[PDB]
Amino acid sequence: GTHEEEQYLFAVNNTKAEYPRDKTIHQLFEEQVSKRPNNVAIVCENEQLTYHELNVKANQLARIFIEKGIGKDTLVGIMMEKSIDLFIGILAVLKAGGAYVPIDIEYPKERIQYILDDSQARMLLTQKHLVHLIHNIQFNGQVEIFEEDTIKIREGTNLHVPSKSTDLAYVIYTSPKGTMLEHKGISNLKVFFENSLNVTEKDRIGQFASISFDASVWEMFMALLTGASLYIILKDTINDFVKFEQYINQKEITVITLPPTYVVHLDPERILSIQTLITAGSATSPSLVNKWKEKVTYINAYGPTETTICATTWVATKETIGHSVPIGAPIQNTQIYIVDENLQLKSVGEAGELCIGGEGLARGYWKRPELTSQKFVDNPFVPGEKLYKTGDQARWLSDGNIEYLGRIDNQVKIRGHRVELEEVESILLKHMYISETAVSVHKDHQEQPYLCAYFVSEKHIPLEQLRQFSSEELPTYMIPSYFIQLDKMPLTSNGKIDRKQLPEPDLTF
Ligand SMILES: Nc1ncnc2c1ncn2[C@@H]1O[C@H](COP(=O)(O)O)[C@@H](O)[C@H]1O
Ligand SMILES: N[C@@H](Cc1ccccc1)C(=O)O
Ligand SMILES: [Mg+2]
DSSP, X not given: OOOHHHHHHHHTTOOOOOOOTTOOHHHHHHHHHHHOTTSEEEEETTEEEEHHHHHHHHHHHHHHHHHTTOOTTOEEEEEOOSXXXXXXXXXXXXXXXOEEEEOOTTSOHHHHHHHHHHHTOSEEEEOGGGHHHHTTSOOOSEEEEOOOSTTTTSOOSOOOOOOOTTSEEEEEEEOOEEEEEESHHHHHHHHHHHHTSOOOTTOEEEEOSOTTSTHHHHHHHHHHTTTOEEEEOOHHHHTOHXXXXXXXXXXXXXXXXXXXXXXXXXXXXXXXXXXXXXXXXXXXXHHHHHHHXXXXXXXXXXXXXXXSSOSEEEEOXXXXXXXXXXXXXXXXXXXXXXXXTTSOBOOTXXXXXXXXXXXXXXXXXXXXXXXXXXXXXXXXXXXXSEEEEEEEEEEXXXXXXXXXXXXXXXXXXXXXXXXEHHHHHHHHTTSTTEEEEEEEEEEOTTSOEEEEEEEEESSOOOHHHHHHHHHHHSOGGGSOSEEEEOSSOOBOTTSSBOGGGSOOOOOOO
């Protein structure tokens, strides 16, 4: 026997590539500043800094952090307005040898206290006008106010803090556990941005994502580690689709990463500067991709916070989009294994849990040893390493691409049959008038489960037609018992569907 299938399942993981494995994020930023110090690094409204200017200010502030005890693996909470100053702060924390815990200021008190209490950050960098948000928490550590003439008085050369790439860089909270990411994964991403995405200094990277979501880390360093510029898009521009479209074209943004939940509202014929559109965070669809692939280079990027943002990508080709948009193949220095409950490899085409190995793996969850040992298991494929169990269902396709099948949690039993919520969602989305869908499970008065489909459409779709369509497209046990048209989909801050905001039907008749 030749064991072809088994060999194929390993060949798909031949992704090794050279990258600065011993360098830190700030080291990489500094080496870019040195190459082109006078390149624009960051733009916000009518203000901007060159790589040199940004570097100097980060170095100055970092020297203040050093004296106040910020060092190896020290966590520094950051709570600042979306601005150039926010990014000076992030870089300053990294330069001081510490890690930052981003806290979005648009957040409620409760969340700021969990992050602060859980992370137990010894320092909180914020701004003068935001301190009232702080009077709603039991913080005891050093509260650093960011308005510095204080900073302009310090030396602006690169510091020489003994930092390793295995030191922590940032801690981002996911649905709530704080994920510890080291420098390594970003060092790897730098090379991916250059070699895979083809990002160069000529690019202008939009900064769309919330600072508390790793997509913002993705954008920030996509710009700052390649020599490109980063454009801080403000909330009021984002809250207005026509304003956002105008911003992109006026600022001549070339690369933007957006949630499919956002892109669905944009007109591709209005967008003119975008060269590369990356969607991530949730599933995109054949209809959406078909609508954009001829205008821009469309990339579907998949990955959990736990493996440093991105584990796989798929690029739309001139060719046929099928029933699903693949999440693609593992990026450089990343391995994917689709396995059963005991970590045994599934046959090609079989559904299993997507597990990730490689250079992007997080150190684990902050102060959660047991959950860490449960999710980051010993890698049976590359002994000596760890393997992250994503909780996602997926299957290997024929062509080396991975097909995402939904969260394992979203598998509900109805009438003794197995239903995956995401599958009902994607099928209903095929309807010519439906632009967005979401399916949820609820129990009726006899505690039995039933499906409820929520959809958005420009015009009112008669339920009779939704029922007929479902009858033709879905197995009986997968036909929603109720269809509910929403004016707009309720989203979380990260741009994902907020299931707990979808109205449950009143079964009282
Ligand atoms: N491109 C994608 N397609 C489908 N689902 C995605 C995609 N990218 C991310 N996700 C989902 O988002 C999860 C990561 O969420 P989090 O780590 O909580 O921010 C992944 O495990 C997926 O379930
Ligand atoms: N890491 C993001 C997904 C993502 C992938 C690629 C780029 C940006 C974001 C998440 O947890 O959902
Ligand atoms: Mg995750």
